[PDB]
Design an enzyme around this catalytic site. Structure first.
Site, PDB file in Angstrom:
ATOM      1  N   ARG C  76       0.713   8.830   2.800  1.00 40.39           N
ATOM      2  CA  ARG C  76      -0.437   8.117   2.908  1.00 40.39           C
ATOM      3  C   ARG C  76      -0.324   7.113   4.198  1.00 40.39           C
ATOM      4  NH1 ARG C  76      -3.926   3.490   0.588  1.00 40.39           N
ATOM      5  NH2 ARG C  76      -2.208   2.387  -0.178  1.00 40.39           N
ATOM      6  N   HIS C 120      -7.995   0.326   6.002  1.00 36.90           N
ATOM      7  CA  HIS C 120      -6.953  -0.617   5.601  1.00 36.90           C
ATOM      8  C   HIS C 120      -6.711  -1.906   6.303  1.00 36.90           C
ATOM      9  CE1 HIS C 120      -3.407  -1.484   3.483  1.00 36.90           C
ATOM     10  NE2 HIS C 120      -3.005  -0.475   3.051  1.00 36.90           N
ATOM     11  N   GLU C 165      -7.852  -1.516  -1.473  1.00 32.66           N
ATOM     12  CA  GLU C 165      -7.827  -2.683  -2.072  1.00 32.66           C
ATOM     13  C   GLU C 165      -9.023  -3.565  -1.767  1.00 32.66           C
ATOM     14  OE1 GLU C 165      -4.173  -4.673  -1.612  1.00 32.66           O
ATOM     15  OE2 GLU C 165      -3.059  -3.080  -2.692  1.00 32.66           O
ATOM     16  N   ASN C 293      -3.294   0.998  -6.931  1.00 33.09           N
ATOM     17  CA  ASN C 293      -2.230   0.271  -6.373  1.00 33.09           C
ATOM     18  C   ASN C 293      -1.653  -0.769  -7.333  1.00 33.09           C
ATOM     19  OD1 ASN C 293      -2.792   1.615  -4.078  1.00 33.09           O
ATOM     20  ND2 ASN C 293      -3.448  -0.083  -2.739  1.00 33.09           N
ATOM     21  N   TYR C 295       1.469  -3.619  -8.694  1.00 32.45           N
ATOM     22  CA  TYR C 295       2.930  -4.155  -8.415  1.00 32.45           C
ATOM     23  C   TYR C 295       3.277  -4.916  -9.709  1.00 32.45           C
ATOM     24  CZ  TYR C 295       2.426  -2.587  -3.659  1.00 32.45           C
ATOM     25  OH  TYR C 295       2.265  -1.762  -2.520  1.00 32.45           O
ATOM     26  N   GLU C 351      -0.073   3.133  -4.086  1.00 30.70           N
ATOM     27  CA  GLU C 351       1.038   2.159  -3.827  1.00 30.70           C
ATOM     28  C   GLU C 351       1.773   1.575  -5.014  1.00 30.70           C
ATOM     29  OE1 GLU C 351       0.116  -1.163  -1.426  1.00 30.70           O
ATOM     30  OE2 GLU C 351      -1.601  -0.077  -0.170  1.00 30.70           O
TER      31      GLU C 351
END
Lengths: 447, 447, 447, 447
Positions: C76, C120, C165, C293, C295, C351
């Protein structure tokens, strides 16, 4: 605190020829008084000399590649006089010229403006044999040298200095015997200072007559002393200390006379300035800017035993660099405001840095104390600019660890480490810090 | 450089009661506003408090033995008010008195002159419940406390301070809410400052009327700010910063008025000093000396956003201590000369030191940075003495690592390390350095 | 425990253009809003920017060789918009296109499927000057950009994402001012979110009309909050936190409406979505998959002071990464099950990784904490696959240490260490661990 | 985040007799089943036993001094049964009683409330010879023991637990053979569990009939398992895992029946609870509180091979302690909410801590991982209190490093390090951290 610098602020680094150039016998280079000095037992620490130094005679392209990655806009370097006139007087050496053409073209190719110092202490030994700067013939040898460079490098160099640190050339070299030619005689020191000033004013004339490109000035080292007590005598001692470094050269230039109090002081010691008719007029030639070399500051008191200026420096307990100088950056702010006595003239900080002797450990040189020093002095620069003073740029002393005169290679000033064993270059952690500052064009202090 | 001090120069160390004394509930001690503050979540780092501190309530004999080996001549300590009057108002606690009799007798037995601070920030919570220093009743409670100590300790203590650091007591505590009682109201802060000043002058009266032995003054913390630019507004910002710490308390004392420009400044913010008739006369009571508390210096600029004084401190890049204060000792020299506006009054440096957080490694605390700090400030002290200023002694802040107010135990100021786990005392390397200085009565700076 | 992944599971790594590409002025690249942002003092830590980043504009072949040794199946990357349309609007730059042709052909040569992110975060500054995503004209500029890439890269790229995002692009950038363009205005943030959603649906239309190859979706960052207490108000706070990241963009896409409770919430704050007729229909364009994504995870409570969502995160004492995020991998499992509200849609984890700042020591980067983090999150992936959810692949964030937006280069996410001094690549210990996982296509947890 | 605990929250530490007491043959102490077990080759790691342990039979005064400096309010300890009844049945040993009188009087002198566990695993070997808890005669031996302690310690102990960790006593000891007496027979394990429950209810009766002071409950170890997939079978496996630890003992107590699904499960395996008429009524005796022992949490899946419960734990990749348990504190929150099925009963966390094996380095034990673990679990405690659950206190497992059953001395749980070579006590860094928490009565999580 964020310190934003002016859009057209000029960031740089600085070297001198004999400190970095690696080839003292090459291409018909004659000997300077510093080859001679360095080759004499006892003059320089460990018997170091500039025979090889950083081999920048041969490795200049890599250095220019390094100072290109730095994001820098100027490079101050000096010209080896005895490369151009291997005797000082005679016929030009084209090989010598060609080297500086190779350097300058490279700089110019990389968008880095040459800031050229004509005289950075390497007087041809041949002229010293005839008395050096004590002889007025050396004034003519100098003007010839100057002309030659003005004509050769006409459109390539836009920034010129006649002399680097007249105080050292005259007093440190001829009164204190610490630097080449290593004499200790007040009258000689005063002769030297007077003659380099005549040579200076005559070279600015030539510059203007030849219609050479750019601007031209002189680059004194600048002292700042602050009195220990409130006494008039301590005050007087500090006035002497400050004025001999700067005013003694700057007041002839800007105001057509030597500092009377210092004239009277030296008369007491039986020395007189060898001023001929017309001399002060020549020295008063208008200059475009000056460079200022600043490292340190001191607190002094009157002491009749404290050298020919009777001015003793007090160890105040401040942290010092590895060469032993206290870091107190306010002295830069103070001396820049002091110099406003000559007008809001254009000023470049043509030297400022620190001896921090860190070496390569795990592939880097963690010279935090150099970043610290620099950061403190750059705040003082922003500060003066924001007081409305015409401070135009800043050159870090020292691109490269090099030959630190009477210290030899022991004392490192570079933002790039040089292993004199290998000639390998390792950019120090200050290098990458400076790269950020000069590329962003603002500084930030943080805790 | 060798700095010889005067024959009768007074060397010391300093503590405060709540910072060192190890027994907050013991022998009928009442709660102070700092027990309360420290016991509130969020007020002090890590929820540290002075419940146990250095346990100097119990270990004072060992500390006095240590400060006897130091070769010291005074000891500055504070008295816990709520030990003596556990409510602030009511009946005396003889156990409280007895403790300080045990301490003082020991000091006097060992040839160490007590330097007594009556008020070092531990207001009885009972009085705070009634409004504390915002209430004038507290002035009376204070004079009673003062009397009690004057009479109890008549021939035993020859050196007295009413208040430690009025700027903190009033502004840091009541405007900035950082210290107990933690309020944030200008008018309250100004009330507190005015009332402690009336309490001060009334206590000096009592001292004189009772014919108490020795001399009595007050001990402000002293700020020094130097302007970033040459502007009048930056100058004005620095005047405000300096004057609120010292002049705001010292000008009523010495000259019978508050600093008008600061009076006007606060009026702008809608606050007025609660001055009753007769108040300024009481505050102008002649005092014998002052103590000066000095740690740091700053470069400030006007900034309308920079707090209630609109005076922003610039991070200049200077090296800081472990609490984050730049060390620049000249500020001591500068503020001592500044204070000559009140006359060549007697001055003791009743606090000066550094947060350096070194710990015990191989049986020692190698606190070279503390030796460095101290050495720099002691040069400034010799310097002012040799300018003819009546600087009479110097107390190092901090005998002991202790409870550093809103920092808790995190920030070490001591010349003697205290492991708060064990209460073990380990004199730091600065201790033995200081021992030499105070015993020889001269300092030497060397490279 | 052995976790066997599906035969056709897609393993990858991910980068973005401005974070890695080393040549911001090169080949007629225009400025993005992030060049602008990063070039503004105070916006990004240490004044870092993406001027040079990883120099992946020049070193992409070595990176592709490294990710080939990894045993990986996709890569990606994002496309720099202002490389293709240096103004956002005007004429295509063929040099920009050529670069991505060099990258893609290399990838395709090496059996690595390009997974292309069109947007992005690097909006051409030119369009920002016209109001950026607040201006509907930017929707058209975007569709043009999208078309250009769809047609240029038709048979070469089989996996496309419109936006990375949206929550950051809109709310972090325009409400919280943390990311470019650095605005703090709810209404603007809502405008931006609505317009990027119209831009998104229009670009999927074009994709289908042009018969472009592969599949196309969008890649939201996904938040997961779990309530501190059992109160409805804490529950509501967590609903707001979760829904603004994902549902606010996904419910228009999948269900043709914005989350009403959040619509009402923002109406309370006086902001309204700028919905024109036909808009919600355009946004509801069928998409082939989404990327997720992930985290981190949090425990939140209602707090009317806790920002515009009034949802405070509790520090639960969990171990954090070097950027300070708690690792709690269950949040991945939980949010993947949450998202089943839109159907068992195809999901790629586009991600997931950790800021672990280990550096090269004895020739390796011993980033055990990164292996630990990854291993925990890959268990959650296997787990959801074995719950029958269509989770299709996993891309590790970060191939390379890179420019971590407002953190600068301080925060390292890479599986390959990059010395930004040298541009030297050192694959970390997690690299070789990941190589094993993606090549065996099963994971093992051991003690 | 600041977590304020209730004013009357009870902070403690916990030990058991055989783990700490240093004198297994002293004063006519008979042998327990754990002396026997530990003295058998192969049962305990390295052949460690509790012959000397921490010598707390002799060093209890120093330990009580240490737990007094902690600022703690209770101390949970167990009574060595075979010290009181060296055969289990016969005549009381007054020397045994005297020891616990020495301990309790000391505690009570120091303001520390005894929290007494009657049974912590040291069954007199004599009774084991007669079949131990498989024999109903042991129920009577136990009630006698209980009576003796109730009458001896009437006004001195206000907090009583009958049994520590019934799951271990029964299933770990008699089904899994891991703990004394080391049997592997389901039916025996079920007999043991049933008989200790009858013994428990009968002892609560005696307590009430004797009018003994304080409150009395039981202290199960509490398991929490969460299913790997969403399958009913994984869900069932977790229900079995959870319910055998807690519900199997708590539902007879609170609801008058064993968990039917587990009854049926064991019937499948051919085992039946030896329930006599009247038994369930006796077991249903009202108790005042329970203690909960919590260390860890797991993710489980159904696996027909995974032991007698067919419930396999998944290695999820989480960080583990030095004994190899994952730390996931939410399990505490979850199980406390789970247990609300018995009502909002009073609950003490009578064990929680971590095996962290750090040792003394430079005079301290830097057990940051223990502070981390504890801090995470104390957040969960505050959290449940603020959900309105009656969680009444918290006892840290382990005052002292001690004899960790089948692990021996290898696995350290203490907040005070014990060098079993010297018996020297070194309070770990978690000790001083806990001191702060229990003395301030609030916790703060910080980054």
């Amino acid at each position: 605190t964020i310190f934003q610098f002016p859009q057209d602020f000029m960031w740089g680094t600085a070297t001198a020829a004999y400190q970095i150039e690696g080839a003292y016998q090459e291409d018909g280079r004659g000997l300077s008084i510093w080859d001679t000095f360095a080759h004499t037992p006892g003059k320089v620490f460990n018997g170091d000399n500039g025979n090889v130094a950083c081999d920048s005679y041969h490795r200049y392209e890599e250095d220019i590649r390094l100072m290109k990655e730095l994001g820098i806009r100027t490079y101050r370097f000096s010209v080896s006089w005895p490369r151009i006139f291997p005797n000082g007087d005679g016929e030009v050496n084209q090989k010598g010229l060609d080297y500086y053409h190779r350097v300058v073209d490279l700089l110019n190719d990389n968008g880095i403006e040459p800031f050229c110092t004509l005289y950075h202490w390497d007087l041809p030994q041949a002229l010293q044999d005839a008395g050096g700067w004590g002889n007025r013939r050396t004034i003519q040898a100098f003007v010839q040298f100057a002309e030659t460079m003005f004509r050769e490098f006409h459109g390539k160099i836009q920034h010129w200095l006649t002399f680097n640190e007249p105080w050292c050339i005259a007093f440190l070299s001829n009164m204190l015997g610490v630097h080449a030619p290593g004499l200790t005689n007040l009258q000689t020191a005063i002769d030297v200072g007077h003659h380099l000033l005549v040579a200076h004013g005559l070279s600015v004339r030539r510059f203007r007559e030849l219609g050479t490109s750019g601007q031209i000035g002189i680059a004194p080292n600048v002292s700042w002393a602050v009195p220990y007590s409130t006494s008039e005598e301590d005050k007087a001692a500090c006035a002497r200390t400050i004025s001999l470094h700067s005013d003694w050269f700057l007041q002839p230039i800007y105001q057509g006379s030597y500092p009377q109090f210092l004239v009277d002081w030296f008369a007491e010691q039986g020395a007189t300035v060898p001023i001929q008719d017309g001399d002060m007029d020549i020295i008063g030639e208008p200059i475009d800017m000056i460079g200022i070399n600043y490292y340190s500051m001191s607190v002094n008191r009157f002491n009749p035993e404290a050298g020919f200026l009777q001015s003793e420096e007090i160890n105040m307990g401040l942290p010092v660099t590895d060469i032993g100088w206290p870091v107190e950056s306010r002295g830069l702010y103070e001396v820049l405001h002091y110099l406003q006595k000559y007008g809001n003239i254009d000023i470049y900080i043509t030297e400022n840095g620190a001896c921090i002797n860190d070496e390569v450990v795990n592939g880097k040189v963690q010279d935090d104390r150099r970043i610290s020093y620099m950061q403190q002095h750059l705040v003082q620069v922003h500060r003066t600019i924001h007081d409305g003073l015409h401070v135009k740029g800043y050159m870090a002393w020292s691109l490269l660890d090099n030959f630190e005169w009477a210290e030899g290679y022991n004392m490192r000033f570079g933002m790039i480490h040089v292993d004199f064993r290998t000639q390998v270059r390792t950019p120090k952690e200050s290098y990458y810090w400076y790269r950020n500052v000069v590329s962003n064009n603002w500084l930030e202090t943080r805790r």
